[PDB]
Swiss-Prot record, chain E:
This is Polynucleotide 5'-hydroxyl-kinase NOL9. ATP binds at residues 8-15. It is found in: Nucleus; Nucleus, Nucleolus. Polynucleotide kinase that can phosphorylate the 5'-hydroxyl groups of single-stranded and double-stranded RNA and DNA substrates. Involved in rRNA processing and its kinase activity is required for the processing of the 32S precursor into 5.8S and 28S rRNAs, more specifically for the generation of the major 5.8S(S) form. Required for the efficient pre-rRNA processing of internal transcribed spacer 2 (ITS2). Associates with LAS1L to form an ITS2 pre-rRNA endonuclease-kinase complex and is responsible for the transport of this complex into the nucleolus. Interacts with PELP1, WDR18 and SENP3. Interacts with LAS1L to form an ITS2 pre-rRNA endonuclease-kinase complex. Belongs to the Clp1 family. NOL9/GRC3 subfamily. It comes from Homo sapiens. The gene is NOL9.
Swiss-Prot record, chain F:
This is Ribosomal biogenesis protein LAS1L. Residues 1-20 are annotated as: Interaction with NOL9. The chain holds residues 636 to 674 of 734 of the full protein. Belongs to the LAS1 family. Coiled coil: none annotated.
Length: 31, 124, 261, 125, 258, 35
């Protein structure tokens, strides 16, 4: 695939603040 | 100072939800302490580990879990570890648990929720 | 290619022997190869990595100044096995499969001599032994100093001010090595963390077993709002091959997460 | 004459053979045939028989995967502590690490239980 | 009709006091009532039973000679409760709700809860009157042999037993955890209490507080409960459950016969 | 109710006090349950 270089805004909010990302459905991969 | 909890929405929601049973709020707040193990490498404070174990036992005992012989196995190990790490009604139970005949299931089904009330006011 | 091996205990001078031997060899021989089996005293890598490093320039300082790209690399996760001496030994063969004279640094001990067909048993404390005869806070600063040296390649700038990358939650896999995190509550173990950008819609695409991959670098996941905003010093050419993240027992130095200006 | 919890020698032998010859279903047929010898003695079983039954009750849950590693290690540790206390330094120190110190790794107690189950195959059964 | 209680420890003479008091009272008063709270030293019953016995004939011997039919009976199962002191005290209410002067044998709640009028001690009118394991087990397996002596007019296995299919009598194993499939071996050749409350097992789920009517022995079950009963045949029809407890046939019965 | 007095059976004479050897004579796979 590819990684998109961000064009949004980073200086203002710190490292960590960008239970809100709580989850109930998850995929699973098997080797 | 770096802490395993992001804010006071994880150090308070877990604190409130660990003892307000609902059969599903101590399960949400028991899987939010297996995440504080990763954030500390692989370690949890002895008190938190004991508290999590004593509710891991409960959520299997209340739901139904397994046979009686295989439910005082969790209860006995949890209580023995709690006493060793963190009177005579609850302190003399470990001797009967590990050295003598297996205590009756009701003895554990009283001692466990006795000691769970001891961690509600001392640590949590 | 007389493969060289080193065996010694704490404070015997083994570390200040590969710096001198390679220095002497670099005068005559053009290149020398290096295999690192240490996990907490890594020389050319951030801590917790088993690598087959390469040397074309001499070593003239502490390990936090010779950060070079390993030829082969495996991100174990913990800078001490001490419980699972059947996976570190298993990882060594995977690293050795990419094998110029070779220096082998070592932290089991009998097996470490075997499995490599060595030609030297230099000790500094084929079985040609030349074994001549010659704490928890100082050894934890030099492990975070090397990590801070890997993050120093992002500077031309505050560490949170650089523009990060981003990848949705369907193109990069996630695994939490050396822990048991509940699958639903897995995005909190990967927020503001130190992940190894290894190689191998719905939020989680978690794996099930720990793979023996080939780590290509290290990055920081600054935040995930419900996009993997990865702050990574790996060159942009190598980012495209990155498709797996593996969290281990190595976190960001607290000074990075602490008060920034 | 004597009175025994086992009817005939075909019941003292079928259990003795089916307990260790696992088959994942013959160790459970002969695991529920020893909860009957508890009734034949009021509520009591010999310490060795209770330990042997507990160590296979533990086994029949890590083979199937009854619960998580943290909760499945609680059965193994309790069973091993009861075995050592009631009936080398590899095993003796395991109980100390289980009760007084950090939680042992799961594979450690798994191998300890799998080894100690061989002790009862030649000594009692 | 004052209620008389007894409070005493080991080796004080409480049973002899009960015998002497009943003997003395039977001269003046016509009848006297008896309540037994002991479980291992039962007087008029096989061991393990809590009963409200009645006396119309004097007591002139050891407890294995004057076996009578209790007015009310509960088959607890265990010769002594030492971990569940909330079911024996709960059973007492079910037994006490059938009450002539009353003598209460005992092994604060016991002193109360019965509305007594006498608390005789022999160690609410205080009086006081201040006055091994292998031997206490012989008299427990001697009263059971006295209950089986009512079957004689004959070897114990020679008498003709009764029959019942596996659909008319329920089965419960008190004081054990027997796997439901492997339950016909815990009841075969056993000592069951013929209490009152096709296919195979009809197992219960909880231990009921029933009214035991007698004691019988199962002899065999081939895939029919061949149940040998000293109970009178008129009372067999009401029998509809079996309860196995911590009381088995004396080994001499199961041992070498002739 | 169903309580038959066993009017005509002959087996019990010598030692059938628990021999009325294969450990499957009274084996079971199904059971009822009351409540």
């Amino acid at each position: 695939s590819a990684w998109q270089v961000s064009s949004e805004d980073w200086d203002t909010f710190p490292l960590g603040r960008m239970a809100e990302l709580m989850l109930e459905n998850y995929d699973t991969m098997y080797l | 100072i770096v802490v395993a909890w992001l804010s006071r929405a994880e150090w308070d929601q877990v604190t409130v939800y660990l003892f307000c049973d609902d059969h599903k709020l101590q399960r949400y707040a028991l899987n939010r302490i297996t995440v504080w193990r990763s954030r500390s490498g692989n370690e949890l404070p002895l008190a938190v580990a004991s508290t999590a174990d004593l509710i891991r036992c409960k959520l299997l005992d209340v739901t139904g879990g397994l046979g009686t012989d295989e439910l005082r196995l969790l209860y006995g190990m949890a209580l023995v570890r709690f006493v060793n790490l963190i009177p005579d009604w609850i302190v003399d139970l470990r001797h009967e648990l590990t050295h003598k005949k297996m205590p009756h299931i009701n003895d554990c089904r009283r001692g466990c929720y006795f000691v769970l009330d001891w961690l509600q006011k001392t640590y949590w | 290619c007389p493969v060289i091996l080193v065996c010694g205990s704490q404070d015997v001078g083994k570390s200040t022997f590969n710096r001198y031997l390679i220095n002497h060899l670099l005068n005559s021989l053009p290149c020398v190869d290096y295999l690192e089996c240490d996990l907490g005293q890594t020389e050319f890598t951030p801590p917790g990595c088993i690598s087959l490093l390469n040397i074309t320039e001499p070593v003239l300082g502490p390990p936090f100044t010779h950060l070079r790209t390993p030829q082969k690399m495996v991100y174990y996760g913990k800078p001490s096995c001490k419980n699972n001496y059947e996976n570190y030994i298993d990882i060594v063969k995977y690293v050795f499969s990419a094998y110029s004279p070779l220096i082998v640094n070592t932290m089991l001990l009998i097996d470490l001599i075997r499995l490599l067909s060595p030609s030297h048993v230099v000790q500094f404390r084929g079985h040609k032994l030349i074994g001549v005869y010659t704490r928890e806070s100082h050894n934890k600063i030099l492990r975070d100093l090397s990590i801070l040296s890997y993050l120093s390649q992002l500077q031309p700038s505050p560490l949170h001010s650089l523009t990060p990358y981003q990848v949705p939650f369907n193109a990069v896999a996630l695994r939490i090595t050396h822990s048991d995190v509940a699958p639903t509550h897995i995005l909190y173990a990967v927020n503001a963390s130190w992940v190894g950008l290894c190689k191998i819609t719905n939020g989680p695409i978690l794996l099930a077993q720990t793979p023996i991959c080939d780590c290509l670098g290290f990055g920081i996941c600054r935040g995930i709002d419900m996009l993997y905003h990865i702050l990574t010093p790996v060159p942009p050419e190598e980012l495209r091959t990155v498709n797996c993240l593996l969290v281990g027992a190595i976190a960001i130095p607290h000074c990075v997460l602490k008060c920034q200006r």
